[PDB]
Amino acid sequence: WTATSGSCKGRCFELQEVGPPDCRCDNLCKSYSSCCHDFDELCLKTARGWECTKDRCGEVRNEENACHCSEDCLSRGDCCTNYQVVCKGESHWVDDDCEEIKVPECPAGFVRPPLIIFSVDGFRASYMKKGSKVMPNIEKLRSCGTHAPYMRPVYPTKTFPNLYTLATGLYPESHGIVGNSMYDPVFDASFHLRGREKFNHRWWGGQPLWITATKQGVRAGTFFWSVSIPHERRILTILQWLSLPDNERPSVYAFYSEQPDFSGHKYGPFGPEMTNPLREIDKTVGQLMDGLKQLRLHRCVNVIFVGDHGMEDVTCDRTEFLSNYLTNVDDITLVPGTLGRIRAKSINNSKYDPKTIIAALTCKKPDQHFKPYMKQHLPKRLHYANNRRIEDIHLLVDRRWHVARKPLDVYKKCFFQGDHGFDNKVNSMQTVFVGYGPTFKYRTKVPPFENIELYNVMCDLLGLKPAPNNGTHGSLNHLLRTNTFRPTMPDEVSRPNYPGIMYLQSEFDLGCTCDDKVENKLEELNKRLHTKGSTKERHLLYGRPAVLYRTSYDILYHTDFESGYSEIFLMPLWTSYTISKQAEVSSIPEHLTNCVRPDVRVSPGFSQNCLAYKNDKQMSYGFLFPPYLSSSPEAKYDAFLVTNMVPMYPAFKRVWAYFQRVLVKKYASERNGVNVISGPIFDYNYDGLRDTEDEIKQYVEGSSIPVPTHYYSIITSCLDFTQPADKCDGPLSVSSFILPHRPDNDESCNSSEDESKWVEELMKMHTARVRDIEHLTGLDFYRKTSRSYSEILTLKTYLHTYES
Template sequence: HACHCSDDCLVRGDCCTNYKSLCKGDSSWLQDQCEEIKSPECPAGFVRPPLIMLSVDGFRASYVKRGNAVIPNINKLRTCGTHAPYMRPVYPSKTFPNLYSLATGLYPESHGIVGNSMYDPVFDATFTLRSREKLNHRWWGGQPVRTVLPYVYAMHSEQPDTYGHKMGPMSTELNNPLRVIDRIVGQLMDGLKQMKLHRCVNIILVGDHGMEEAHCDRTEFLSNYMTNVDDIILIPGSLGRIRSRYPNNPKCERETKRPGKTMFCKKAEQHFKPYLKQHLPKRLHYAYNRRIEEIHLLVERKWHVARKVPEGRRHCGFAGDHGYDNKITSMQTIFLGFGPTFKFRTKVPAFENIELYNVMCDLLGLKPAPNNGTHGSLNHLLRSPVYRPSMPEEVSRPATSGLVPAGADDLGCSCDDKVSCGPRKSHRNLPYGRPAVLFRTKYSLLHHSDFISGYSESLSMPLWTSYTVKVSPLPDALSNCVRPDSRVPPAYSQSCTNYRADKQITFAFLYPPQLSSTVDKKYDGVLITNTVPMFPAFKRIWGYFQRALVKKYATERNGVNVLVGPVFDYNCDGVRDSAEKIREYVSGTIPVPTHYFAVLTSCLDFTQAADSCSGPLSSAAFILPHRPSNDETCRSSEEESRWAEELMKMHTARVRDVELLTGLDLYRRTTRSYGEILSLKTYMHTYESEI
């Protein structure tokens, strides 16, 4: 609209944002060149640069490709400031969970807003977007940034989400709401320039989630999979959450918790997978809250799930949706930071939105409340970070272990060949330093030529095992024997006798003996201290990882360091179980891990070998659920080469997730800064196509 060119508007402070450009001939902010703001330039009276938080609902990361013809102002902020190719939302990729995760740095299972609608069995109440119940403080956990209003201003736009739902994310009609949002951003920047605040204010522009194509015709109906759909309550749509309609009826409750028998792999073309919530990928952090139903349906992108076919023909009122697995490309959203505190013309790796809370607190001079982010992991966004992270102190150092008398106890094991543990090669097998143990326990280092283990007395198995595989490992040298380890007393060792007696469980090696550098050294790998308890079904995945994938990754990356070990998370809170907690679930026997982890590290520059890397590192992590069946894949009757790697990628994770679940701290001896290491630990490979 035309601006009234009245000079007294400057005195009154009510000028239109285009007053200077329209009435005085000044350039608009968009017309100005990018300028590097090396320090805040604020009018008198400002204690610190204010923070303006712009949140755009449903802004799929790929929308930035529409360019200057559609979003010139957003593009300029992105180009002149700091941006990531995308920001990953938390799961579920819905609005309320993500906005509150941005405000608190907490996962939904931690702050309690686990969906746009949810039922709390203790409150016996339901939270929905349209009810007044959502205004009740009892639902909202954490300590949001909004409690410090004087220096933070927030704005949320419900576009382009509304149009994305209606028209679909690929529609050219989305350009109209995107232009409106961009024009508002331009007005903001012109207004800040007019008030001489454009070199003072820090601006963060984020989305809450992306948008995927969807349509009513692509709907799975549970009535095609189970007979008792009238006995369940389903939160439908791009994900499914199921609870019993009659929670006080034991039979109905029991039937509701049987997804494996009623819905697993029932059809060849099934577009959802049912999970008990404790079996969901750990990277989702979506189990440890009473508001999360026991049964969860992960729905394939572009599809929906509903209880039963609606009566009568209905008009389909949408062409897009969100809420899907937060690692898929279409769910990724935008992040950019602009202002004197952010770096100039800088692109940073993608990250998860829980990390932003600590950055906002740093910008505002606040001490963050406890949260799920890793403080300092986004320091590379900032010109002069105020928080300097430090490496955590090691709590338990390895005991000095000497050989103990072997005695006569062979633990029921037999092996014709003798073993002699070779010379220590710590640098090759631990090129990035020994993992530190951050909890009280007793363990010792067991050295071998081709691998090193941190062996736990209380667990009678390694906490971790580390080895480095060269580009072309030697041919397999297989062995079918297991032998006792004279360095560990029988009381702290597993036994072959127990494995033979238990028909449900077998053993597997953490370091694969077939990768030994010589035939003689394979016998280090068959020590019983290199074994862990494993379900036979899971051993198929583990065996394929060891014999095929490790070699594949080593060849692709010029060698790879492999760190593997057990995970114990019986209570599903995403944090290592203490010995006392494990005893609550397992008594009198060697505990069976709930998961196994693998962290693969190589040089980002593949011209350098993994164990002699002088530059940035590259890592990939997996947290694999240890289960007695491979139902999750629906292809377990086929060869492992057809499904095992795909299943592992489903359970990709951050290195930081591994650390939380094991109580370990990794990468303690590298050439990189600790801030860079934190960024590495919080990065997650999604194995998705580029944005």
């Protein structure tokens, strides 16, 4: 109930919302059906429009007008944004040459540069270049401030997940808004774009920027606007707030535009009807910048022009129907569209089975435009598993396509030409970032970054301590002139052991055999030097990874590779080796095909054994350092040590052997050498974090050898590829992957063909940031380089996307 008999007199767009049943006058009262009876009359005036004309100059103040051109309006802070241009001979902001803002130039009483966020829905990244002719204001912000070629949204590339990710710095699995439509089984409640459940605060996790500011004494304007409030009124409200007295004036604000997303759905991303929405966005930006100039704030405020996601060409005829795949269509609930989420229609149905659903959706049609996943098998870069609102069964839908349950859902629920929601590495889903102001850099282009990183920067801009989030604080320091956050490397928690030769061969009973008894002072001092680390500078280029948790492990040196061997997990946590451009690929000699050798540096009790692999009919093994890349026949025996062995399904060994035999050499040729760090990952609860020992759900049969869920590799080289990987003087270049360790290749529909037709495609889909691997392993890489730590943090957040 709301007693709407109160009045908004003197309360238009008040900043604290008053509790029911007293009537509200804030910018969200419409959305709650709770405004006072006179809100429209007093707070949403429209008379005479939004622009001063020559004849309105010096007028007598008429309070009925939407904005004012009278002489007192600057003091009252309610001029039309073009007042000084029309009435006082001033120029529009966009017509001024841009001049470097070296220091904040603020009116007295401003304690910090205000932050104004200008967020645009569906602003695809290529609009900045393709629409530049009709967006002069936005183009001046872009070219004179700091900008990225594009900003990567989060998956799913929907509106609410990405807006709340921007506000919190969290993956949607963590902040809880995992789609535009959700069902929460603990609540037994459903979240929808239309309706009032979405207003319930239990859906919204984390701590968004406006809460972080408020709790630390930084006042915030209210970020959200009821849809019927026109853009001109939102701009005027923000400008009016900026004229408030110092003790009442907010320091952070947000404007939101439902365009160009609204038209993009109707006409497609580049339909001829899209030019006018782009013009109107720019005009609104011009009004804000003109308004800031009037208030003498255009060289004081930091402005962020940021989008939530892009837009793709999608039509009704490009729809896949689950009725063409499933017999039991009526027993599932499908969350449809640019992604698919499937669950049982009724929890009292125990004839429901996800295994048969997935199989019926797997590689069933030659041109199939979606791929089913159990959510824990989705690429780890999507970080879309660890929430009860994310259904076990997920469909990754091809760009430009939709998935629906039945054909009647599409014509009884074409009427659209654009949509979004696809995989967040898709080019059409990318969106924009521009930073403009005293704290941002001048005329600076920064590399693409992910929108999860913005929350830290916005906290930096306001002097706030960020709540715990998924950005890497300091990775965007290169965007800022000042206010940078200078992080320290995390301290290493576990220091390694350096075992020498401590065990005789006969102490081992592992069931392993190797034909290695075929057998100097020349190359016997040499092999001693290698086992003591004499080639470690070549294969450990950036220092040893730091172990950031309490564990027991050994450093093992070899001619061709170095490893950190875990005595808890009975396998390396990491294996590091350098492959130069000139390195040659050899084969595994016939007599060494099944060779596995005890490591006389590591006790039998802390070693794997070959008998377990023999007895386990499902599990084979592979090697982290590849025997194919041994530098010499004698060095190849090191690659068969029991301490270099990891459990692998035979189906995965197809992938791994092709990567080790073919791709590493190809990358070394293309990048002028590469350094490779490979290892296992255990994430059985799919939370993105390293599993403790008591969370492992599968072992090699009859043993304590834990089975990894994933295998990673970090492949580093010199950004200036005229320099070899091991003699690099400047910035580095990296690509990484987190390959799921699966007993089948059902994910790859062409896997019965040669590995040259499908393996690299699979690896590209599971590309990863170094930072993702750090979360999954508890390791810290790149500890010893010549580069600044902030640059290294940027490198760790880089994602090689393989888009064009």
